[PDB]
Symmetry: C3
Subunit: 413 residues, 3 copies
């Protein structure tokens, strides 16, 4: 009754026929090497070479590049005009990177009038707040997805096998099973990481980082991006100060201190993380976490008996073509690839269809294929503008790929 499947990564074994078991925890930032001449195959005249290599864990993050976080100074200036409307004149703050203007139009009923202006209900008094002394204070990225893997190389006799194993996965070679359990994520999807210096000097994790309502003083309030400045809103209140024969003066009741200055005063409240040999290219960040306390559990079984049974073996063949796509690249909501998967050589097949481009894969769907044609939907997260996403099974991908839409990542107002 059990139909064919390749979703289980592992073995059926008989322990009394196991030549060698390794079971151990290993730091993420540690590699591990083991070499031994095995005194079997009960042949004595000839021994069996055995190499096991496990590289340090590499972390891969698909990220949204957010630009440069800016520090700035708050300023306010007043501009009075005796007649006309507030549009009929330009203002000095309009030369600033970020500015917000409130206009008191057609209201100088003596109470608010300079000596030279004998008008009532005319003219305009313009109030403008602007930011200057802008300086870049760090680079920020929002995490779309996180991947954890270790390269593993196995040599049994004169046959070598190397593969990148994802965390909580197993590798199965003809006589060796290697499994990893326990890698846990300190970073989380949608975290914002901030680098006050080069990546090599470590980052800060910020759970509060403004997204939908960026107000001056919020974390991430002033961002300088490739597409120009992103300026914060000012939520305070304006008030026109007036006296006899004196020109009106603007007064603002609101926050004056920038988000960066607010964070540095309590800098030690936030979690840092350190990066060994980070690699940043476009929207991909890879690195090795140097924290020695983060450990995963490693199990190796060397078993050369005929009862050593790879649980994924099957005669099924899968042919793939990419039908359609919807959604966005570089998005935490993601894209959905619609695939046409043809099965031959089996009545049914339970397997995993992935969405991949030239660089890597971004998501995976477990599906139960029937002989002939099937439609499978795969959700991917990550990728970039030039990405042509393909349907893949193992290393076999469809001939043609499909580009996703640009993500909606913009402020309102």
């Amino acid at each position: 009754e059990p139909g064919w499947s390749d979703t289980a990564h592992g073995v059926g074994e008989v322990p009394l026929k196991t030549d060698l078991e390794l079971d151990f925890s290993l730091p993420s930032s540690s590699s591990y090497s083991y070499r031994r001449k095995l005194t079997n195959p009960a042949n004595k005249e000839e021994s069996i070479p055995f190499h096991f290599q496990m590289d340090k864990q590499v972390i891969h993050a698909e990220v949204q590049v957010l630009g440069h976080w800016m520090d700035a100074t708050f300023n306010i200036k007043t501009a009075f005009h005796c007649y006309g409307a507030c549009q009929k004149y330009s203002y000095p703050w309009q030369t600033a990177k970020c500015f917000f203007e409130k206009d008191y139009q057609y209201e100088n009923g003596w109470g608010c009038n300079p000596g030279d202006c004998p008008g009532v209900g005319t003219g305009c008094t313009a109030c403008g707040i602007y930011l200057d002394k802008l300086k870049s204070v760090g680079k920020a990225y929002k995490i779309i997805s996180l991947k954890y893997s270790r390269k593993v190389c196995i040599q049994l006799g004169t046959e070598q096998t190397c593969k990148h194993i994802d965390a909580n996965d197993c590798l199965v070679t003809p006589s060796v099973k290697v499994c990893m359990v326990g890698t846990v994520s300190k970073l989380q999807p949608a975290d914002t990481i901030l680098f006050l210096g080069p990546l090599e000097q470590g980052g800060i994790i910020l759970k509060q980082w403004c997204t939908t309502s960026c107000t001056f003083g919020d974390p991430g309030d002033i961002m300088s991006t490739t597409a120009g400045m992103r300026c914060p809103e000012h939520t305070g209140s304006f008030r026109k100060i007036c006296a006899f024969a004196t020109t009106p003066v603007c007064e603002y009741q609101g926050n004056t201190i920038s988000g960066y200055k607010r964070m540095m005063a309590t800098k030690d409240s936030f979690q840092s993380f350190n990066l060994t040999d980070p690699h940043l290219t476009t929207n991909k960040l890879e690195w090795i976490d140097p924290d020695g306390n983060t450990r995963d559990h490693v199990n190796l079984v060397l078993n050369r008996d005929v009862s050593f049974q790879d649980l994924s073996d099957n005669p099924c063949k899968v042919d793939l073509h990419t039908q359609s796509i919807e959604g966005a690249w570089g998005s935490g909501v993601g894209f959905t690839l619609t695939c046409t998967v043809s099965l031959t050589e089996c009545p049914s097949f339970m397997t995993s269809i992935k969405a991949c481009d030239m660089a890597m894969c971004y998501g995976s769907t477990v599906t139960n294929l029937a002989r002939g044609s099937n439609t499978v939907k795969v959700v991917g997260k990550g990728g970039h503008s030039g990405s042509a996403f393909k349907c893949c099974h193992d290393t076999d991908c469809s001939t043609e790929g499909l580009a996703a839409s640009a993500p909606h990542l913009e402020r309102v107002t």
Copy 2:
């Protein structure tokens, strides 16, 4: 010296007497089936049938139903009355779902007076902001608790055993141990999940969702619930515009754009999750995560020797009665069930007492029972209004159950 205990789920075994070990990782959205005729019991004339079935992982979430998130339009209108107080008249905005009013009372010292109203320090000018064009944009739930389990069925010969195994737990039958490790939680307790459409189309995870201070423009600002509308506060400032002989006009300095419009502009900043075959009934949401990359580690040991020792075996008997309860159902703080647990047939017993109703269990306490009467406190989370929570050990529950209080889930102001 070791007293009896049933808290350890697992075995003591001798590996050289193990007939069969399976060790493998499996996607959460994958099932697994294995059938084999075992060529033992060294009897040859007769073989041993063996079935192993593992269902896809099911996720169970106890949720707080938050109602419908609403999109709306911001509006402001002015109402002047020449004499009397602002209470002495009704206003058009009072017909709206959400409205906020600020009244300028007894202040028209000429500066603020229409031509027809020759009064000073009398009358009132009422300012009112209201929301209209309300449309439902999705359904939101806050997660109280998360459970992960897989149904497992074992057939050895002509004897079958099926049980739901929780993640990071083991099942022990007479000759089979099955264990699961490594399932990790993407959703977290107190997350808010938002469904812009039917559950089958997936949800959005929102770390920022207003709870204690809902302001217009916040995520979750305007909620339409069974108990009526929940309206956001407006934190901006009002100002009475005045000119000669013209009637006063209200002006507001504050946010105008709704929370929903703010999110959609940056929709791709947030994490989505997808649901296969979701089931929603009252405050319970169950589903299968279709993400193929989420794997758990599965270990099966088939061992028929007399040294195969179930570590939970014991002669102890436990009788239960539900004494008292405090706390709330449907709450992330929870309720505390106070139980009276009588032990017989053992001098002491280390065991787990659970809080359960008709549907499921909601929490568990490990306790060291002494022969005779004991008091045990169990913290549960979840449940609903009709829940009668009982003290249980294994499948044995107390005769009577106790209802918890309603949760405090309300805005102030």
Copy 3:
């Protein structure tokens, strides 16, 4: 080719030579005890005593003490002076714990003047909001780091070994390997935990707790610390009410309800956690989580064959001296200890260097030492003012330690 290393905690074994394997899941709040007389060493006349003890899991949190969260009442009062400036007089609100003042100076152009004050553009009207009826409502701590461990004691014959094992780590004695996998963290670094009563009655987890912009009504708005009060900002707007011959009155458009009152109205929206036997000393909180559903996977292997191979064995010797330090204690960003590590008796050595004081260790670096002198940097989190941080390998620490700087944990404005 493989150089020496002690980073792998575990064994190489032959399963057919294993006398006994235990494999089981165990609640965190449960201990486990196993005693058996092993009928080997195939000697029959003499048996082998075997004890295995596993204590309940203990949670250790390095915390930032935040003081007492305060509830308060909002108040506003007005003070008019006919002449002079607003500084020329004191005010009743200046006697309050928290107060904020806005001064309307030199503006009484008749419109705002009491009958007795015949001045224009002179005097001042001072507006002051203050908080009273302050009452402590709980104690709050921000989590810097979390550690999970179980004490384990092994007796084989007449030889005993006890050690605290960290989660996801293994202990290796001459013939026993014990490993733990699967402990997962419910609390997270940078979480804020709030205790409305004694620690024994449980805490509340709050993802939103004000850090960089504390506004009246935010969670954690009013904190009473050892260094005095920490007062919230008020972001609303002021307005001077005026009429004929009457003295001006202040009006505020802003939040009036405190953060504590706002939380209690929706108290059941937040996650609680319970503590068995908590220990608080300065900035260290230790406890046992009584939730019976949290389980870890335990594996014990008893194997007395000569092929039982501890993977960390090595002849290398390491000598340590503490060179320099930068960073802060009690910080989530942490400190960096710079160590001088001398290797002898090996050409190279892959090992872990830790940062420790008298109490415990706070971080760890995996490094590849060359024969002779090396510089290693270790990142630690936690500690306190008197901490002298040392470079350590295993139980061997440097003679002298170095104190870190105080953390920057202050509000601006």
